[PDB]
């Protein structure tokens, strides 16, 4: 069935993640001996590691579709390139809590539009930068 | 792995030895015949003799009139079909023993007493970049 | 029962701009420490979980004990506890205000000193058409008889040891 | 350098102004702790009554 039976926000973001995971899969063979590797290939490897750590999920804790869209969107736009892959799950709890508490207007705009606007993309860029700076600086 | 561990242990001290030797030629900034090819009679070690011979083939397309002194039969096997008219000498029975200075002096005495004319030159060897990466350069 | 529900939160942005980062790195500890108590404030909201008493009344053969439990639950409605060290914060608040006033007037004094220094530089004649005596007058470091001798009278030619 | 020293003093005065909001943050931090402790007991009382039921 594919993308014919998923929401616009999830389809728009998971399409990019599917391409990036395919790119990481192609260059995963060069990580075995790649002591010296190109910056583009290192970015593909670093993005794929964050995306692989993104898909991990604990048992008996299913997630709402808005929580899934927000977490996948952060990992696919490059917000987690500075976050270590061993702290992604802790970032997943805390940043979603901050969105569910301080920036509920972003979720209301996404729910009304059904997708992610470039204006909301800029707002999500700012609140991610504010959140990572507030956690550590 | 046992041989590599022993060889890297002695390379840890024999690398600045070559740094001091090459320092004079670096300071003179002299820019370039004879070609020294370093190989061994022990094959099936990977892409060592094939890629070094490939670099030697690129020298045959750049300096076709340069005599080459090879240390190892594998380089002789690859390059005899192409440029058998431009092979000075090929050393053999080498590789099983570890390289020591006496073997180097044997090659050094071979370059001198042969009397062959040479102004510039270079030595072909596999550099040790890392555990999994080796580069073919020239000194 | 009142005062501070979880919605209350001060402006962290102005506070983060005010502190000199690692010079006041205890704020980085303080924010996380306060954030941990927000995690405790995340759990246990004001009202507890409602309980359907009628289901237990009908299921139990004798619902008199359920009625007694419900009556005692409604009777025992304890309110909020008492604030303990609010006066100490108020006392340090007054001390902070005194330190605020002391630091403000000292900074005002240093600002007036810097303004006077800039006024001196503004009124200083330019170094192009300046006589050597006027350079000595405007900069009173000077040289005279009770002065450190040197082959070239410079800023630090004397000790150098 | 004199202009920079003026701006540094301006920041120092502003940090003194934000000392009050730090105190309010400390007051809210105390109130948050007292709320989380008292409301958990209210949750614990409700769970104990449910345990009795």
Tell me if C16 and A97 make a contact (CB, 8 A cut-off). Answer: no
In angstroms, the separation between the Cα of residue C135 and the nearest Cα of chain A is 48
| C-alpha span between D19 and C116 (Å, rounded) | 30
Residue A109 has, within 13 A of its CA and on its CB side, a CA count of 14
Q: Using what technique was this structure determined? A: cryo-EM
Which one of A29, A31, A34, A35 would you mutate to disrupt binding with B, by most B Cβ within 10 Å of its Cβ? A35
What are the phi and psi torsion angles at B122 (to 5°)?
A: -155, 160
Q: Which residue on chain C is closest to D20 by alpha carbon?
A: C93
d(Cα B22, Cα B100) in Å, to the nearest integer?
19
**Strand partners of residue B87:** B68
| E strand segments, A30-135 | none
Q: At residue B87, what are phi and psi to the nearest 5 degrees?
A: -120, 115
Residue A134 to residue C42, Cβ atoms within 8 A: no
Report the distance separating Cα D21 and Cα B129, nearest Å: 58
Q: Which two tokens stand for residue B91?
A: 């050393």
Distance (Å, whole) CA D45 – CA D43 = 5
Cβ count within 10 A of residue C46: 12
Residues of C in contact with D24 (CB under 8 A): 10
Half-sphere exposure of B8 (CA within 13 A, CB side): 9
* Cβ contact C40:D36 at 8 Å: yes
Q: Do B and A have ≥3 inter-chain CB pairs under 8 A?
A: yes
* Residue B119 sits at the chain A interface (C-beta within 8 Å): no
Q: How many interface pairs between A and C have CB atoms less than 8 angstroms apart? A: 11
Main-chain dihedrals φ then ψ at residue B91, nearest 5 degrees: -80, 145
How many Å separate Cα B41 from the centre of its chain?
13
Residues of A in contact with B130 (CB under 8 A): 35-36
The partner residue sitting opposite D23, judged by closest CB among C56, C89, C121, is: C89
- Whether B47 and chain A come into contact, CB under 8 Å, resolves to no
CA nearest A70: which of A7, A1, A137, A124?
Answer: A124
| Cα(C85)–Cα(C37) distance, integer angstroms | 17
Q: How many angstroms separate the CA of residue A116 from the nearest CA in chain C?
A: 26
């Amino acid at each position: 069935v594919g993308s014919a039976a998923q929401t616009r926000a999830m389809k728009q973001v998971a399409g990019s993640m599917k391409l990036e995971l395919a790119q990481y899969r192609e260059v995963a063979a060069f990580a075995q001996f790649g002591s010296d590797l190109d910056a583009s290939t290192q970015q593909l490897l670093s993005r794929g590691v964050r995306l692989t750590e993104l898909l991990k999920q604990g048992q008996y804790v299913p997630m709402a579709i808005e929580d899934q869209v927000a977490i996948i969107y952060c990992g696919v736009r490059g917000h987690l390139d500075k976050v270590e892959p061993s702290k992604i799950t802790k970032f997943e709890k805390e940043f979603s809590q901050h969105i569910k508490t301080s920036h509920r207007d972003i979720l209301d705009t996404i729910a009304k539009e059904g997708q992610i606007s470039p204006d909301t993309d800029a707002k999500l860029k700012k609140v991610v930068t504010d959140f990572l700076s507030t956690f550590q600086a | 792995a046992a041989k590599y561990t022993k060889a890297e242990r002695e390379l840890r001290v024999a690398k600045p030895y070559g740094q001091g030797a090459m320092k004079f030629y670096e300071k003179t900034e002299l820019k370039g015949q004879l070609i020294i090819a370093i190989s061994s009679d022990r094959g099936l070690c990977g892409a060592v003799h094939s890629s070094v011979g490939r670099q030697l083939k690129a020298d045959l397309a750049a300096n076709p009139d340069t005599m080459v002194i090879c240390v190892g039969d594998k380089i002789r096997n690859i390059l005899q079909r192409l440029y058998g008219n431009n092979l000075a000498m090929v050393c053999n029975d080498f590789g099983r023993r570890p390289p020591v200075f006496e073997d180097a002096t044997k090659v050094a005495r071979a370059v001198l007493e042969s009397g062959m004319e040479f102004t510039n030159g270079k030595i072909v060897y596999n550099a040790f970049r890392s555990v999994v990466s080796f580069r073919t350069t020239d000194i | 029962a009142s005062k501070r529900i979880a919605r209350s939160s001060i402006d962290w942005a102005k506070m983060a701009e005010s502190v000199p980062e690692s010079q006041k790195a205890m704020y980085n500890q303080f924010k996380a420490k306060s954030d941990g108590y927000i995690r405790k404030a995340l759990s246990y909201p004001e009202q507890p979980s409602p309980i359907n008493w009628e289901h237990y009344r009908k299921s139990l053969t004798n619902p008199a004990m359920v009625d007694a439990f419900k009556k005692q639950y409604e009777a025992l409605k304890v309110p909020y506890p008492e604030d303990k060290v609010s006066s100490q914060i108020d006392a340090q608040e007054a001390e902070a205000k005194k330190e605020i006033t002391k630091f403000i007037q000292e900074s005002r004094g240093r600002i007036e000193n810097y303004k006077a220094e800039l006024g001196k530089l503004g009124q200083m004649i330019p170094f192009e058409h300046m006589t050597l005596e006027d350079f000595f007058e405007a900069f009173p470091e000077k040289v005279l008889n009770p002065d450190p001798p040197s082959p070239n009278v410079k800023k630090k030619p004397f000790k150098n040891n | 350098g004199f202009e920079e020293a003026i701006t540094l003093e301006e920041r120092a005065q502003k940090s003194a102004e934000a000392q009050i909001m730090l105190f309010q943050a400390k007051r809210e931090n105390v109130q948050f702790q007292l709320e989380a402790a008292y409301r958990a007991r209210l949750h614990h009382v409700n769970n104990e009554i449910k345990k009795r039921l």
